[PDB]
Amino acid sequence: LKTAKVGGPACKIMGRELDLDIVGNAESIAAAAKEMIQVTEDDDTNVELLGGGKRALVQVPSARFDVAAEYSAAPLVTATAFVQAIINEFDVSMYDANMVKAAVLGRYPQS
Amino acid sequence: AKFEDKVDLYDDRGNLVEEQVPLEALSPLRNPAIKSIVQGIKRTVAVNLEGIENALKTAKVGGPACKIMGRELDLDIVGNAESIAAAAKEMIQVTEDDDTNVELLGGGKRALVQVPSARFDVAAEYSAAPLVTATAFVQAIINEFDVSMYDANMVKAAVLGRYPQSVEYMGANIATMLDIPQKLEGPGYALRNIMVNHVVAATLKNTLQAAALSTILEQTAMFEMGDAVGAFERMHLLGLAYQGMNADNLVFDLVKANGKEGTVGSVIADLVERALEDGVIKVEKELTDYKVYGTDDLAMWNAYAAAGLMAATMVNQGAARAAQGVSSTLLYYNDLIEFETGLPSVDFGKVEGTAVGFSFFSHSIYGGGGPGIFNGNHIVTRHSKGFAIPCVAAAMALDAGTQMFSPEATSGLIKEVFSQVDEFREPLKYVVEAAAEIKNEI
Amino acid sequence: AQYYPGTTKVAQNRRNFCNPEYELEKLREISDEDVVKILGHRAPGEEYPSVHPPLEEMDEPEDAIREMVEPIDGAKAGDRVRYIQFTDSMYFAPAQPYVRSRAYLCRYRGADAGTLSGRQIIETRERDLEKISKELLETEFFDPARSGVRGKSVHGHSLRLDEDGMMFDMLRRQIYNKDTGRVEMVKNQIGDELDEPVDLGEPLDEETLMEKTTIYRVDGEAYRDDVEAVEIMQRIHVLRSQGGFNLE
Amino acid sequence: ADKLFINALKKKFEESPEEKKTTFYTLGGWKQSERKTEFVNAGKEVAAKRGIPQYNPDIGTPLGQRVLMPYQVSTTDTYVEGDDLHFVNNAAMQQMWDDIRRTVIVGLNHAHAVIEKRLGKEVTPETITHYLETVNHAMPGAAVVQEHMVETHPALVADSYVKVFTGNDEIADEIDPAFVIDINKQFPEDQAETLKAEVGDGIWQVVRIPTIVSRTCDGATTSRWSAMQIGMSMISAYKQAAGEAATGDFAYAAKHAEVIHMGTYLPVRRARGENEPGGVPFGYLADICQSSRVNYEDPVRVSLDVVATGAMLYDQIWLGSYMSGGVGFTQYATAAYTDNILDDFTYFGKEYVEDKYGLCEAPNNMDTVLDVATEVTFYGLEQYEEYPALLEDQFGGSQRAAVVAAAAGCSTAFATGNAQTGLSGWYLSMYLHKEQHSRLGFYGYDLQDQCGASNVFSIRGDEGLPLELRGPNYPNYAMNVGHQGEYAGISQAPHAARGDAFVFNPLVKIAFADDNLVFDFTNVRGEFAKGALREFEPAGERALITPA
Amino acid sequence: ADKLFINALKKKFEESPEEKKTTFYTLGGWKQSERKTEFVNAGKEVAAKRGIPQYNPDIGTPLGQRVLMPYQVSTTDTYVEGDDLHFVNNAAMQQMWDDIRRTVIVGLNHAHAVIEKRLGKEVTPETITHYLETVNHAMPGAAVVQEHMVETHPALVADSYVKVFTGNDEIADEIDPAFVIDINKQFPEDQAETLKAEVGDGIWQVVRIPTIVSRTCDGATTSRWSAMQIGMSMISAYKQAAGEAATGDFAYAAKHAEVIHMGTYLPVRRARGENEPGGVPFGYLADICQSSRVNYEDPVRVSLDVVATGAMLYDQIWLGSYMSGGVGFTQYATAAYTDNILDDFTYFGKEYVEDKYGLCEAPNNMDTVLDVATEVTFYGLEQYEEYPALLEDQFGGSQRAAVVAAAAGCSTAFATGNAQTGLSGWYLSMYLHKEQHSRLGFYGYDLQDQCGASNVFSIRGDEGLPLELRGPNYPNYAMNVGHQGEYAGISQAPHAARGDAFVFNPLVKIAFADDNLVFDFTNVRGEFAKGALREFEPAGERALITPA
Ligand code: F43
Ligand SMILES: C[C@@H](OP(=O)(O)O)[C@H](NC(=O)CCCCCCS)C(=O)O
Ligand SMILES: [Cl-]
Ligand SMILES: [Cl-]
Ligand SMILES: [K+]
Ligand SMILES: [Mg+2]
Ligand SMILES: [Mg+2]
Ligand SMILES: [Mg+2]
Ligand SMILES: [Mg+2]
Ligand SMILES: [Mg+2]
Ligand SMILES: [Mg+2]
Ligand SMILES: [Mg+2]
Ligand SMILES: [Mg+2]
Ligand SMILES: [Mg+2]
Ligand SMILES: [Mg+2]
Ligand SMILES: [Mg+2]
Ligand SMILES: [Mg+2]
Ligand SMILES: [Mg+2]
Ligand SMILES: [Mg+2]
Ligand code: NA
Ligand code: NA
Numbered sequence A: 001l002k003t004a005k006v007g008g009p010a011c012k013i014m015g016r017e018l019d020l021d022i023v024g025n026a027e028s029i030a031a032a033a034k035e036m037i038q039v040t041e042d043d044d045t046n047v048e049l050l051g052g053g054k055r056a057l058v059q060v061p062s063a064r065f066d067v068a069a070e071y072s073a074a075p076l077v078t079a080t081a082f083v084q085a086i087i088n089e090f091d092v093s094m095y096d097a098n099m100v101k102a103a104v105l106g107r108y109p110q111s
Numbered sequence B: 001a002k003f004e005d006k007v008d009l010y011d012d013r014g015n016l017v018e019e020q021v022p023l024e025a026l027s028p029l030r031n032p033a034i035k036s037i038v039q040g041i042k043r044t045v046a047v048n049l050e051g052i053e054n055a056l057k058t059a060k061v062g063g064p065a066c067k068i069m070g071r072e073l074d075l076d077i078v079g080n081a082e083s084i085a086a087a088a089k090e091m092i093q094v095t096e097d098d099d100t101n102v103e104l105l106g107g108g109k110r111a112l113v114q115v116p117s118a119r120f121d122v123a124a125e126y127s128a129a130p131l132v133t134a135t136a137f138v139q140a141i142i143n144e145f146d147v148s149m150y151d152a153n154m155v156k157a158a159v160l161g162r163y164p165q166s167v168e169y170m171g172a173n174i175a176t177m178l179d180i181p182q183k184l185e186g187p188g189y190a191l192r193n194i195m196v197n198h199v200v201a202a203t204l205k206n207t208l209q210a211a212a213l214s215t216i217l218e219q220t221a222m223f224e225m226g227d228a229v230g231a232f233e234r235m236h237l238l239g240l241a242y243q244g245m246n247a248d249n250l251v252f253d254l255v256k257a258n259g260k261e262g263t264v265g266s267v268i269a270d271l272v273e274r275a276l277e278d279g280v281i282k283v284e285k286e287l288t289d290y291k292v293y294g295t296d297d298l299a300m301w302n303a304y305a306a307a308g309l310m311a312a313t314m315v316n317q318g319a320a321r322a323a324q325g326v327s328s329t330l331l332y333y334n335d336l337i338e339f340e341t342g343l344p345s346v347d348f349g350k351v352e353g354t355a356v357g358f359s360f361f362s363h364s365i366y367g368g369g370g371p372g373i374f375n376g377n378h379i380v381t382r383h384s385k386g387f388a389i390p391c392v393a394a395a396m397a398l399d400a401g402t403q404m405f406s407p408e409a410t411s412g413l414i415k416e417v418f419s420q421v422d423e424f425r426e427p428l429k430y431v432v433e434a435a436a437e438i439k440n441e442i
Numbered sequence C: 001a002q003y004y005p006g007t008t009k010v011a012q013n014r015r016n017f018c019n020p021e022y023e024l025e026k027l028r029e030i031s032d033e034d035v036v037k038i039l040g041h042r043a044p045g046e047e048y049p050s051v052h053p054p055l056e057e058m059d060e061p062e063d064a065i066r067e068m069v070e071p072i073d074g075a076k077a078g079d080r081v082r083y084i085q086f087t088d089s090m091y092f093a094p095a096q097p098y099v100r101s102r103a104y105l106c107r108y109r110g111a112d113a114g115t116l117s118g119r120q121i122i123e124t125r126e127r128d129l130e131k132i133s134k135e136l137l138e139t140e141f142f143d144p145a146r147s148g149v150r151g152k153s154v155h156g157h158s159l160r161l162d163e164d165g166m167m168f169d170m171l172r173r174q175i176y177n178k179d180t181g182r183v184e185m186v187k188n189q190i191g192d193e194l195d196e197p198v199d200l201g202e203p204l205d206e207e208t209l210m211e212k213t214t215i216y217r218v219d220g221e222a223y224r225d226d227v228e229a230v231e232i233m234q235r236i237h238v239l240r241s242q243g244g245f246n247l248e
Numbered sequence D, E: 001a002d003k004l005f006i007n008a009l010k011k012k013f014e015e016s017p018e019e020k021k022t023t024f025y026t027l028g029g030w031k032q033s034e035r036k037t038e039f040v041n042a043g044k045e046v047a048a049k050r051g052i053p054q055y056n057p058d059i060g061t062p063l064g065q066r067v068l069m070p071y072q073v074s075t076t077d078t079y080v081e082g083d084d085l086h087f088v089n090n091a092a093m094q095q096m097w098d099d100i101r102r103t104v105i106v107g108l109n110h111a112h113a114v115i116e117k118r119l120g121k122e123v124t125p126e127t128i129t130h131y132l133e134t135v136n137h138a139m140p141g142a143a144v145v146q147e148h149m150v151e152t153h154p155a156l157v158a159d160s161y162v163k164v165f166t167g168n169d170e171i172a173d174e175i176d177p178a179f180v181i182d183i184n185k186q187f188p189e190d191q192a193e194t195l196k197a198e199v200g201d202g203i204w205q206v207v208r209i210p211t212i213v214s215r216t217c218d219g220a221t222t223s224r225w226s227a228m229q230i231g232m233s234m235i236s237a238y239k240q241a242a243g244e245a246a247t248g249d250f251a252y253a254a255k256h257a258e259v260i261h262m263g264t265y266l267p268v269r270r271a272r273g274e275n276e277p278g279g280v281p282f283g284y285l286a287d288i289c290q291s292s293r294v295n296y297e298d299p300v301r302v303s304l305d306v307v308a309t310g311a312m313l314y315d316q317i318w319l320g321s322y323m324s325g326g327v328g329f330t331q332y333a334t335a336a337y338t339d340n341i342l343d344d345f346t347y348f349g350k351e352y353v354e355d356k357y358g359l360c361e362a363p364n365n366m367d368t369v370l371d372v373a374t375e376v377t378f379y380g381l382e383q384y385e386e387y388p389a390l391l392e393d394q395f396g397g398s399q400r401a402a403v404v405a406a407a408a409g410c411s412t413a414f415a416t417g418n419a420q421t422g423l424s425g426w427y428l429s430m431y432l433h434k435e436q437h438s439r440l441g442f443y444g445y446d447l448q449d450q451c452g453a454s455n456v457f458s459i460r461g462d463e464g465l466p467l468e469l470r471g472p473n474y475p476n477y478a479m480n481v482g483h484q485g486e487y488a489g490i491s492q493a494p495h496a497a498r499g500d501a502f503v504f505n506p507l508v509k510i511a512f513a514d515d516n517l518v519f520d521f522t523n524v525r526g527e528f529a530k531g532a533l534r535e536f537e538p539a540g541e542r543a544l545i546t547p548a
């Protein structure tokens, strides 16, 4: 986000930079994401910060897969929960939020 | 609990079943009948024993018009179907009293197979259903007739086709409602790649049941895709309830009031009246002889509008008893309602956009086809997030015979096998009953 | 119902076309036989072909939706689905493409309407199509100079008029008669010659075209000057935009 | 001054552009046209030679009941019948695609690390030069290690070669300059400094495989062919064992870890490998076009050269052939690069923005979108109303929708400096246009249009993406003419207004700054005109190996 | 009599073929070769013209320390250096692939039902002829309905057309014969009766889109282009509404329900659409080759014409370019179609079988596999031992493995009448060869070889398949030279011995029985020779639209 380097190797969109203190607010972001990822309170959802907030371990609740055809709910539910949690943490505008989406999930669905 | 909304649930005759059910009792994530339906569709396979036998006898294997002269094998498969199916079942099951089902149909010409749910619990996806079923029947046929090492590869070709030279099971004599994982337009799309004709076939052209099955599959995919996570979840649940489950009898009552003489426009007028009476919308501003409507609940407005969209399809394509105009209804219901109200149409323009391309690709040279060959994974009709395809299912259910590529043409094997399954055939019944059962656990 | 915002003659005409309680002005008389000839799907006196048996002859299972929705007469009979298609000049034809599709799904049952820039189509059961087509041809939906019945080779909506005030037609289906000041349809909508032409009446004069038109133009009523109509379009854009982002 | 399309309208018709009436049916049908006449005669000859009927003007309906128009290629003085702008009939258009399809960018950063760390040998400008002489022998299809190899004819593959670039000037200047894309030579000073800072000390190859191969095969061939000959050249130039474990690191690096494809592969319904048009994102298409480095003082010219590039590739070759075929989609595309019409509308919008806000100084919000896109949309539509000849020229509603909305969207992005609000303006233009004229495009034109407003700022999985990252495989965009090339223009617009050296990938920008290409990417519309006139010389022909 | 390869060995070397010793290093390197000399001179001109070094004989190791050999194209008297058999340098080879890539087979059975059932109109030989006149105008890219269409130049697209065939003699004989592939004329009586019985009253179009388009685009274009112009021609010829609901039924039928692609699409790692070489199953390749209908009294000739077809397509163009590139794999393939070597070995095996069992009369079992495949393998290997010139000719172990095993496998299938036991014999040949000479092929040659025996008769998901249905995407086969074309030959072998009209798809067989093709599929090896000599005239060139 800070560099607007999104969408794959060597890609960059000049003018789209957003400077958000994500790692410094990792606890709040992770908790907000967890509330979206879980099905019910105290189910088998895990969202654990690692490396001083630089990384998160996410285990999407098993119940989502019991009513899914396959396994893509894990990255897709996780991605949108963190995109939404970041937008909401910093009140990212309608105009800029698509950069958060690109920073999390990349060039999909063009790729 | 997460949402305060409650809905009244009805049967396909418009009779109340249960009042004031919490919305999340209808969630794919909570409702045990939706789970059962989805796991059922992952695990169920139609086996055409007659088709396998005929492919072998003629050596017509590997796809359309293909044949290998000299490879013919004449095996009495249908005459020994009971033994073959029992042998296949022993290989397909995990344990002897699990939820494996293998049931002969049509005098042994067809088999219904439901691969045990436990295989999917330790699988990444759903391909174990055709692959386990295929090899169990290949092996059972070889063993029944002591087919030699030299010939057995023809049995494999007759069952599963040109795979793996082809990516698909090209020429296979088994069928599933799902299609292979490689054909997904995006991750999470598998429950969308289910032909409309297959849904109509499974539900025996019962209009409300077809709409319900299609909505359940579409909106369950929206959870797998992550679209119904967070901000959007309530919108998707309300859409499932009001457009596909006839919540509050709104679809049913709009059809009743407009069925005799009504049009898309008359349905719109009634829906706007009902939204206003129920407090979903309110006049925000007066222009010159024109009221601008607003809403404090966009997700509920969207759901009301979606119910009206379904009713408009039922009224318009029901009156023609011809499905083709569903592309038009999906377009102009939404176009009209925006200029009637000043509010956004269903799925914020995405149904209207889907309908523009669907109209084009069902009346042009470039691709597509008739309504029944579309699905939520089709490039033409993937764009609305669950609010378009169920109307196409309803319209095809109402078609009296105007389509070349009808469910009778595309989905006969699916029909025979999948309509046997009560929860596939009458899903509205089972999902409503399950919602009522868990209503106080939400 | 409201149908359409705006305070211009154009806006009022758009509402009138949509409003099934608005009586369309009848401008010309056309015989049943001549409507059939113009459509070109069957010969006068030919029985309606069928695409499936009459609904009565079918043995359909219980379906509350079917029971509540009355089939149109041609659906009961099993008629083929057939079409009528019109092209409307941008030089002030009374009807225009989205005006038609919007109006058709307010006024007509069992309708498959499609809009394109150069052509607009309705498909429905054949006998019902014939009844609707009479209205589409006899009333102010149609002007025989600035509108055309065309199932193919539709070019002309955007072309300059000819010296008689007639829209271009590659296939010349409608011919202006200087001696009568009337237009004759000399071919059916797909372009096959009629044994006997059909009188379509006089073209509307300029004053009347301006009274009746549903296109906005700088040399008529400009859309940008119908500020309430523009306001609603802009509102829909903004509300769709916000909704797709966060449902606010 | 006159509106920019007036000269073209006067060329096409005998009437003045404002005249409302004409006469039809008197031109002799196809006989009015030099080109149709050529085609009639050619069809007779073809049918006589092969014994099967072919082109016949009496099949179907009779073309030319109206004037069959010439088109001015915008920014040129060339007027041609539209058939000369069909990609089949235009060797410049074909070569433009071949030059993209046959290119990949391949890093040397992992390879040089393999050399220094795993092989324990030094890399210098001298060793890089030796490697480049080697790979320029090998890449076109010639041998460097084995005995009894048989090779490609050098003259059939003369268009294949390898160059390099790097942001380190002193390193670039030490490599033999025959092999170097010189960033300081090709780009104006401020753009050069941006691009060099992006690349830094990285060293990248631009590999072009032979046109004749690309035509025989497909786009997914390019990175493989590239990697084989890089691999052989690493073996030869750095005196390696000819096939040891380290050989696989060079392969993985050249095929996967440091390759940039022009296009990504497509899903099964439209199955294609890499380096096909549908995989090329809009920001890459804008960066391939080289107008940005020549015409930088004129952001309209830069943006509309990108529109031309994309309208041709995406509508004529991609949608009109790969995804359909036949007569195809020439004029759906030509509307965006002929008669100076889009140019007139877009200069109007740029001047409106300059005067009211200043370029890139408007608030990046919906108020600006509503203001600019509405104003420009009404201007464009007014021109069709004021000039009946203009409306008869751009006779298809889709053509008009694309042109008007491209001007509106580019103008909105000129104001905000942001492509996403530009995109919102494109959709607003469509909605206004539809209400003004009670029509828009062909039956299926506004699928993406109606999904459009809601998906501009969405963040959901298969909905949300900055415009620069979108492309022909963005779901809503996957089917329909009259959008994709215009979106590439909108992607370019804010970057041209900002003076940015690139839109989405600096490596892609540098990789086409190369006069050894067959097509001249600095002047796409001039090249289309040259091809129309049958004056373009493509690569890939088989004349040397066939009878005289 | 002399072994069939003796003439070729005598042409290559001054020594008699039996001689064990020679002298090297005295030929002047590349200077011994007319072709290398041409290449050196061309490289100097290219480098000077473009300002970048290119072909240079001093780069890497010095070719031609041994004799750089001529090759006899088998069944011809044409001797050429191997560079003239590189697909890049051989227009016949390129056109062979274009003619397959640009072909689709498209039924009329749904289309005619839509006409009769949904529209309620009649279909007769007269209306079909009118439709065929229409579609032969439209298919190359010309208009039939709209005004102001711009079109392809008929002379650029002269190779595009539509024919039909049907098993109904009465219909076939009344349709205008310009448009009909006449099964009774093209096939001997027995084969014609088989084919007509397979097709029955079905009517099928053979659609060939323009070479120039296929080269610009890809294989997945073909069925789309076909369907667009079929759809326009249905509208025009049967006087339909130009875009109503029924139009979509013609589209779905032509694009999906009644189309036969030459190749199916590929998985992502090797992503490609339809009508690419990897999707063409071995049985289709055998059926495309038309040797079966000309040389039917000689099953060896038929089988080895199929091997030539497939070795070139699959090893040179597919594996050697689509899947790799560079100098590529000319001689991995030429081993199977030059110097009459495979011919010698395979005639030996056919005689062995004929004498011992009778063709097709051996038990279809492992005893027959062990007998025949062993005997033929030992014959082939003995020839390399007895003729040092032969071993120096087919210098790469892979080449020898492929040739010996092809003879062994074809011979086994000649005995059993079944391709699967033929395939088992191929793998046994490899195992024996490996033990005899303590070598087999290149580093990765016997991946499929070692999986081979176990997967011949497997029935598991991605293992079990009759050989005719296998192809380049069968998992074990997806990577390596020296197998795929030979498998196509083994697929042909039992069918040739049985006298069968086709191997896997009768529609594909009939679809290439057409002298309006550019390449002559009845004489594949003759055509490769003609291309090598620079005497073949391809389609798709652009000379007409480029300067003099
Ligand atoms: C048969 C269809 C339905 C369909 O699926 N495709 C068609 C026809 C197809 C054919 C026409 C070729 C021919 O005449 O043989 C081709 C060229 C595609 C092909 N198969 O190569 C095409 N359209 Ni169409 N098509 C076009 C257009 C259009 C415009 C033309 C309106 C007008 O007033 O003339 C309208 C849609 C609309 O009303 O907006 C249109 C309709 C239609 N389009 C109607 C025929 C209309 C008629 O009967 O006259 N196209 C255009 O608006 C401009 C570009 C133009 C395309 C050729 C090019 O780009 O050069 C062509 C693109
Ligand atoms: C829809 C889809 O066709 P099918 O429904 O899969 O036959 C798709 N064609 C297209 O999107 C055609 C796009 C180009 C022609 C229309 C341009 S407006 C394709 O061939 O994959
Ligand atoms: Cl909500
Ligand atoms: Cl060297
Ligand atoms: K190609
Ligand atoms: Mg059980
Ligand atoms: Mg046994
Ligand atoms: Mg009032
Ligand atoms: Mg009357
Ligand atoms: Mg000026
Ligand atoms: Mg003039
Ligand atoms: Mg003739
Ligand atoms: Mg130079
Ligand atoms: Mg990767
Ligand atoms: Mg130059
Ligand atoms: Mg000699
Ligand atoms: Mg003749
Ligand atoms: Mg299929
Ligand atoms: Mg010949
Ligand atoms: Na004709
Ligand atoms: Na014509």
Ligand code: NA
Binding pocket: D143, D144, E056, E057, E058, E059, E060, E061, E062, E063
């Ligand atoms: Na050398």
